[PDB]
Amino acid sequence: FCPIVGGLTEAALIRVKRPTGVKARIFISREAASRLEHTVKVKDPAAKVSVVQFELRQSNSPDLSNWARFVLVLFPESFFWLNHGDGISNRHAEFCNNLLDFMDSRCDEDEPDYQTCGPRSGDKPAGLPTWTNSGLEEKMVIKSVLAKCIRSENADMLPVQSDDVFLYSTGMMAIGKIARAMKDMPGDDTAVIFGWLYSGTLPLVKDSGYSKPILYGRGTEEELDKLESYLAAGGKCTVLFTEITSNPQLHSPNLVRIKNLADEYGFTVVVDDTIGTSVNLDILPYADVVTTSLTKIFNGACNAMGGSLIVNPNSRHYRRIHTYLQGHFEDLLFPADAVVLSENCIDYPERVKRCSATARAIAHFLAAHPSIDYVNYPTLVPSREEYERYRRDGEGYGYLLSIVFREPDFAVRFFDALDIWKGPSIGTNSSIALPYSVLAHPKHIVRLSVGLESEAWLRDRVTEALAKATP
Amino acid sequence: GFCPIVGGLTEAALIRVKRPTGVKARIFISREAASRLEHTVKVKDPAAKVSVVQFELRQSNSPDLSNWARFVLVLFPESFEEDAFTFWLNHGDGISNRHAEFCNNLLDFMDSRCDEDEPDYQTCGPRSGDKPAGLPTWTNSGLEEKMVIKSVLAKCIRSENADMLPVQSDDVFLYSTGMMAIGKIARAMKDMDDTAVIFGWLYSGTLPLVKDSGYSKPILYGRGTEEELDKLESYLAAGGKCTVLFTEITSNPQLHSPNLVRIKNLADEYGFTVVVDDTIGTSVNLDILPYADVVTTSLTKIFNGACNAMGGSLIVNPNSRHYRRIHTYLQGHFEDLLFPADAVVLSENCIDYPERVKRCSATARAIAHFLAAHPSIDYVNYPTLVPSREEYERYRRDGEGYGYLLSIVFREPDFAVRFFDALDIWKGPSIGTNSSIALPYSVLVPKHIVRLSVGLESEAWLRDRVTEALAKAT
Ligand SMILES: CCOC(=O)CC(C)=O
């Protein structure tokens, strides 16, 4: 069985004499851990929920004692998930499992079973990690590249600096941090979620204190008319959340009109540019804050975790937003994860351009097939000309697309005959498809993230799948 | 299955060859290993399609990348149910965990070749020829780290007292698993004349390893008793042939120790080579070099302790009459199959390998005697308590302890079951871990025995987890 990978939760549950009877989750943030405790306590009071702090307590190595700690949360089996942004990183968990014998346990409400001292606590580990100084050199490579590929083609716009970029453990943690930041500043606090679903943003915004936000599902011009009618009447609005190159329909919102409404009614615009990249699009003039999941195409390798937060120095709220984000900043991006991101980010522009070219060819190849009703891709969707107001010159139309077949039961046979990776993540170096089975947490849509493979390769796997689906 | 995904090299390779469904797969480093699996499936169902696809990163400017980013993919129908022979021959020949994630990161830069003409297995990587985004943190195939491993192994087998030559680092051979070391030495001895003795050694892969190696006349001796040695001597005196004998110093799971002195004396009179595995009874605790021609060691176990690296060891005794025969063969046919990242971890954790052995021998001794004096316990298998005790006290260095492994035989089997399930420690088949672990007879001699690998925790800690389990078993 051994060498074993994973097992930090099994090892931690053994250390607290609870291998059974409870479920467990591991966080780096006690803030995020406490939120899970509240979620269970507000669904069932008197439920035993304990929050155990593991720490490597007595070391003179600053790297180890600042990173070899985690928070274990126990709750009843009776038993959020869209909050998969605050859990322990994969490489962070394997780091803390290797050092668990050197770590001690604390719990505030003292159940004496949760106060354990490690078998080797105080002793020196057999080796040091390969990264040094919290991986802050690799974190600055990440911040510089993120800042350099969002620089706008407008030469009269202030550039983005590395210190205007904030790194977090996931893209959802980045969205959570900016949502909690806008709530804490004074004034009213009603948020607008515009053209953004099939993500964790709505639950995260609700849990960050916006008790219920104005949802605009589609991201249409009519939707914007309803928003403007409400603002002109005297309605309040402090922050708007939207995503550039929306999923899974590849819609593009009117960032110009959104920015114009923000300019007269004084709210903050948060745009996520994970799907439509900053390599392909120039959205800096229209966003006050840009969120990006580094786990996706930024990394490509699908072996590292990260999230980014870009505060626009051209924003009327730059100063207020940056002061809060830096005021409450905590380095929660595990260094090993930062090492991989800083290496794979070097060819992030090149890889984006490559899979946008192939995605355009595959989208138009699929569009011309009789079994397909229509294909959702920026070159083919009604927002086509909207996508072009922001498209950088010489650049393409993204790596994501979705297929709507004519008959739903053809979509199912096609998806099963399609010999490529299947799963929920996007921005991978290998192409991946998702059905409506997942993404449900048209009802026969098939989403496709296009990777780095040749156009002949992807064309072959799609054709063969269409053949086996066709009677 | 959200990204980052751990593992998935086998799923990614199956997609590359257009066979994500309908087939089973195994990934090896050696072509010989792959060919052995193919034969085993072909002789149980000849009409089964078995293909062997070699993945390789062919041309890199770093020699590290192109020599280690290569693996062998073996596909066979799902109809095949794996037997014990293939199970163990796969547990010793499979790709290491860190080696699998290394080649998954580089799979886009690798191409596929197949000897048999199936065009679906002749693929070019999407990024083939391009430069990888980064280099591994280890350099020069980790041969500096590998020299620490060979140096440490050589220093703690240096036979005490007597009058023998010391073991140098170049007498140590590193392999990917403990069984790969046993497999390599078994095939080496075939060239000489084909009778192998496996002595006090089961619950291991040595029988499949030796049988598949070519020994056409095997002799199994389950316990390692003196009475089984009498059967061997009667057979040798009668004129029987025997070329190699396999034994483990402290047996699994009864902690028995064979008469290595008598075994070595028989080897000196009938001219066969003795291979001793010292994984359980360590080289820190025991001095067995005078009685073995070859010593094998699983580095995955207490040598590493952290249960996060894979390695196997082969030490050729320079005081052996066959030293120059066996050493020449092992290097005549040597291939570096220890992934450098695995060697880096082993080279770090081995530095306190003697210290950790002493720590978990002390705790295991205290807990063994605690269990022995409990009314619910019939007897405990530990070198201080077994009839084989006095056999260990000859090979045992003084100031050193009695090992980290023990097994418990309760008086009532249904007490053993309730005890094992109430026992709040790690459960699994591996031993030599830094945290203590238990195994029932489900996995793996009474059929209610409970085996225990003792880790680095206090006696107060281990006694507490044991006592509480005993309470709930009453
Ligand atoms: C966390 C965002 O997840 C996605 O990338 C889109 C999805 C849920 O399928």
PDB file of N, CA, C and O and ligand atoms in Angstrom, chain A residues 82 84 172 198-200 247 296 424-426 434 439 447, chain B residues 2, ligand 1:
ATOM      1  N   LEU A  82     -19.280  24.513  -3.384  1.00  0.00           N
ATOM      2  CA  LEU A  82     -18.916  25.640  -4.229  1.00  0.00           C
ATOM      3  C   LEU A  82     -17.892  26.537  -3.552  1.00  0.00           C
ATOM      4  O   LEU A  82     -17.277  27.381  -4.210  1.00  0.00           O
ATOM      5  N   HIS A  84     -15.146  25.380  -2.479  1.00  0.00           N
ATOM      6  CA  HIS A  84     -13.960  24.534  -2.592  1.00  0.00           C
ATOM      7  C   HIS A  84     -12.715  25.394  -2.759  1.00  0.00           C
ATOM      8  O   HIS A  84     -11.680  24.922  -3.240  1.00  0.00           O
ATOM      9  N   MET A 172     -11.936  31.196  -6.142  1.00  0.00           N
ATOM     10  CA  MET A 172     -13.110  31.486  -5.326  1.00  0.00           C
ATOM     11  C   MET A 172     -12.729  32.261  -4.073  1.00  0.00           C
ATOM     12  O   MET A 172     -13.487  33.127  -3.619  1.00  0.00           O
ATOM     13  N   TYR A 198     -23.637  28.968 -12.593  1.00  0.00           N
ATOM     14  CA  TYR A 198     -22.834  27.748 -12.698  1.00  0.00           C
ATOM     15  C   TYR A 198     -21.469  27.915 -12.039  1.00  0.00           C
ATOM     16  O   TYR A 198     -20.494  27.263 -12.418  1.00  0.00           O
ATOM     17  N   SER A 199     -21.404  28.810 -11.057  1.00  0.00           N
ATOM     18  CA  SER A 199     -20.205  29.085 -10.287  1.00  0.00           C
ATOM     19  C   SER A 199     -20.608  29.187  -8.822  1.00  0.00           C
ATOM     20  O   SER A 199     -21.789  29.090  -8.473  1.00  0.00           O
ATOM     21  N   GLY A 200     -19.621  29.378  -7.957  1.00  0.00           N
ATOM     22  CA  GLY A 200     -19.898  29.549  -6.550  1.00  0.00           C
ATOM     23  C   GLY A 200     -20.048  30.986  -6.104  1.00  0.00           C
ATOM     24  O   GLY A 200     -20.010  31.253  -4.898  1.00  0.00           O
ATOM     25  N   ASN A 247     -19.877  31.450 -18.880  1.00  0.00           N
ATOM     26  CA  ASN A 247     -19.998  30.016 -19.110  1.00  0.00           C
ATOM     27  C   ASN A 247     -21.388  29.520 -18.728  1.00  0.00           C
ATOM     28  O   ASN A 247     -22.021  30.067 -17.824  1.00  0.00           O
ATOM     29  N   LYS A 296      -6.608  27.400 -13.637  1.00  0.00           N
ATOM     30  CA  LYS A 296      -7.041  27.023 -14.977  1.00  0.00           C
ATOM     31  C   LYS A 296      -5.962  27.304 -16.017  1.00  0.00           C
ATOM     32  O   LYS A 296      -4.815  26.874 -15.852  1.00  0.00           O
ATOM     33  N   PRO A 424     -14.861  18.444 -14.650  1.00  0.00           N
ATOM     34  CA  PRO A 424     -15.413  19.801 -14.539  1.00  0.00           C
ATOM     35  C   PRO A 424     -14.438  20.949 -14.756  1.00  0.00           C
ATOM     36  O   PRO A 424     -14.899  22.089 -14.908  1.00  0.00           O
ATOM     37  N   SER A 425     -13.131  20.708 -14.786  1.00  0.00           N
ATOM     38  CA  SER A 425     -12.200  21.824 -14.848  1.00  0.00           C
ATOM     39  C   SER A 425     -11.975  22.265 -16.291  1.00  0.00           C
ATOM     40  O   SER A 425     -12.215  21.520 -17.245  1.00  0.00           O
ATOM     41  N   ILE A 426     -11.501  23.502 -16.439  1.00  0.00           N
ATOM     42  CA  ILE A 426     -11.231  24.108 -17.735  1.00  0.00           C
ATOM     43  C   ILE A 426      -9.812  24.659 -17.715  1.00  0.00           C
ATOM     44  O   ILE A 426      -9.128  24.641 -16.690  1.00  0.00           O
ATOM     45  N   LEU A 434     -17.523  18.302 -20.522  1.00  0.00           N
ATOM     46  CA  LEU A 434     -18.425  18.178 -19.385  1.00  0.00           C
ATOM     47  C   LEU A 434     -19.862  18.078 -19.886  1.00  0.00           C
ATOM     48  O   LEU A 434     -20.262  18.850 -20.773  1.00  0.00           O
ATOM     49  N   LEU A 439     -22.323  20.178 -13.600  1.00  0.00           N
ATOM     50  CA  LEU A 439     -22.599  21.569 -13.959  1.00  0.00           C
ATOM     51  C   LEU A 439     -24.058  21.897 -13.651  1.00  0.00           C
ATOM     52  O   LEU A 439     -24.476  23.056 -13.737  1.00  0.00           O
ATOM     53  N   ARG A 447     -20.205  21.058 -22.806  1.00  0.00           N
ATOM     54  CA  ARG A 447     -19.144  22.054 -22.744  1.00  0.00           C
ATOM     55  C   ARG A 447     -17.802  21.413 -23.076  1.00  0.00           C
ATOM     56  O   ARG A 447     -17.542  20.264 -22.707  1.00  0.00           O
TER      57      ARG A 447
ATOM     58  N   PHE B   2     -12.178  17.728  -9.802  1.00  0.00           N
ATOM     59  CA  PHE B   2     -11.678  19.059 -10.125  1.00  0.00           C
ATOM     60  C   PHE B   2     -10.153  19.095 -10.113  1.00  0.00           C
ATOM     61  O   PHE B   2      -9.511  18.319  -9.406  1.00  0.00           O
TER      62      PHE B   2
HETATM   63  C1  LIG C   1     -14.980  26.986  -9.574  1.00  0.00           C
HETATM   64  C2  LIG C   1     -15.368  27.295 -11.019  1.00  0.00           C
HETATM   65  O1  LIG C   1     -15.657  26.088 -11.665  1.00  0.00           O
HETATM   66  C3  LIG C   1     -15.583  26.161 -13.060  1.00  0.00           C
HETATM   67  O2  LIG C   1     -14.533  26.308 -13.591  1.00  0.00           O
HETATM   68  C4  LIG C   1     -16.854  26.052 -13.899  1.00  0.00           C
HETATM   69  C5  LIG C   1     -17.704  24.858 -13.475  1.00  0.00           C
HETATM   70  C6  LIG C   1     -18.337  24.831 -12.084  1.00  0.00           C
HETATM   71  O3  LIG C   1     -17.877  23.951 -14.219  1.00  0.00           O
END
